[PDB]
Amino acid sequence: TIITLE
Amino acid sequence: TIITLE
Amino acid sequence: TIITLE
Amino acid sequence: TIITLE
Amino acid sequence: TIITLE
Amino acid sequence: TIITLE
Numbered sequence: 001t002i003i004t005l006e
Numbered sequence: 007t008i009i010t011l012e
Numbered sequence: 013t014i015i016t017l018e
Numbered sequence: 019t020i021i022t023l024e
Numbered sequence: 025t026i027i028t029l030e
Numbered sequence: 031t032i033i034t035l036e
């Protein structure tokens with residue numbers, strides 16, 4: 001699982 | 007699962 | 013699992 | 019922002 | 025921001 | 031910011 005917030 | 011918010 | 017906030 | 023995975 | 029994985 | 035993994 002990948003969760004990314006830039 | 008990939009969740010991305012830029 | 014990867015969680016990233018820049 | 020809310021991201022939830024159960 | 026809330027990120028939750030159960 | 032809250033990050034929770036149970």
Ligand SMILES: [Zn+2]
Nearest residue numbers: 001002007013
């Ligand atoms: Zn993954």
Ligand SMILES: [Zn+2]
Nearest residue numbers: 001002007008
């Ligand atoms: Zn995936």
Ligand SMILES: [Zn+2]
Nearest residue numbers: 001002013014
């Ligand atoms: Zn991983």
Ligand SMILES: [Zn+2]
Nearest residue numbers: 019020025026
């Ligand atoms: Zn919110």
Ligand SMILES: [Zn+2]
Nearest residue numbers: 019025026031
């Ligand atoms: Zn918040």
Ligand SMILES: [Zn+2]
Nearest residue numbers: 025026031032
């Ligand atoms: Zn907070």
